[PDB]
């Protein structure tokens, strides 16, 4: 994927 939500 491109873009990781769980990191923010």
């Amino acid at each position: 994927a491109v873009g990781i939500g769980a990191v923010f």
Epitope: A1, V2, G3, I4, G5, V7
Partner: antibody, heavy 123, light 113 residues
Framework: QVQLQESGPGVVKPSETLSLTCGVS??????????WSWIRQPPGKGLEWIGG????????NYNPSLESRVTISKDTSQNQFALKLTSVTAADTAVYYC??????????????WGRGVLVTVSS | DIVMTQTPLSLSVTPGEPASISCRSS???????????VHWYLQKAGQSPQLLIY???NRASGVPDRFSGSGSGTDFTLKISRVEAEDVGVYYC?????????FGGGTKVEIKR
């Protein structure tokens, strides 16, 4: 530029430990804004996310369904991303992928997947 | 865990007509930072998954204009304006909003004859 080169034994005996390596060709594992993941695919059954780590904060996340048995590490010494899985059963027979994901679009507009390595659990 | 539900299980397309695959989440994929963290891949036979679309609608850097993504919230759609022979395989949706990341069950796309 960057290619992920996977390797590991194809056969692991039941109750033993599976170990896979993901070499980083064309870059270093310590680059900022990347998430590193292990995903597996049983023969003909779809994709399961195992775990990953975020470089900027070195937070490591595990899939709770495996969290007891899995160890994921970054290996700066060998420019490698590593997976270790204990007490394997036939249920762990699968194709294993490492993937590098830009956590932000500025870091990249595509991810990178390794070719995938088949691991068979059998005696 | 967020469940991703893909429909249909299988689709048959004659080359050149559009195809449309559906993915629906058990909860919203919108983060408070304003991004929606859902993605589309194609995995061809004996090959590793290939990222087609990230964050609902964006095209990964080597993907033709023929692939497009739409939706919001909980409902997402991948559209292939014209299916070509090279587009056969299994398409997956994935969420990266919360741990663990979860994939849909996959949609097998084959050629009708």
């Amino acid at each position: 530029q960057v290619q992920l080169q996977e390797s590991g034994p194809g056969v692991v005996k039941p109750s033993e430990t599976l170990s896979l390596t993901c070499g980083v060709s064309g870059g270093t594992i310590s680059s900022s804004h990347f998430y590193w993941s292990w995903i597996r695919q049983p023969p003909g059954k779809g994709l399961e996310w195992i775990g990953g780590l975020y470089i900027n904060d070195e937070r490591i996340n595990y899939n709770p369904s495996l969290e007891s048995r899995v160890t994921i590490s970054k290996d700066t010494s060998q420019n490698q991303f590593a997976l270790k899985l204990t007490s394997v059963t036939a249920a762990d027979t699968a194709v294993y992928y490492c993937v590098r994901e830009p956590v932000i679009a500025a870091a990249g507009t595509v991810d990178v997947w390794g070719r995938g390595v088949l691991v068979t659990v059998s005696s | 865990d967020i469940v991703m539900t893909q429909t249909p299980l299988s689709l048959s397309v004659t080359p050149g007509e559009p195809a449309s695959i559906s993915c629906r989440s058990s909860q919203s994929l919108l983060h408070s930072n304003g991004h929606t963290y859902v993605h589309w891949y194609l995995q061809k036979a004996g090959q590793s998954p290939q990222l087609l679309i990230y964050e609902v609608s964006n095209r990964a850097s080597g993907v033709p204009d023929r692939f497009s993504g739409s939706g919001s919230g909980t409902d997402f759609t991948l559209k292939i304006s014209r299916v070509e022979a090279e587009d056969v395989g299994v398409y997956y949706c994935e969420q990266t909003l919360q741990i663990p990341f979860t994939f849909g069950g996959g949609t097998k796309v084959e050629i009708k004859r």
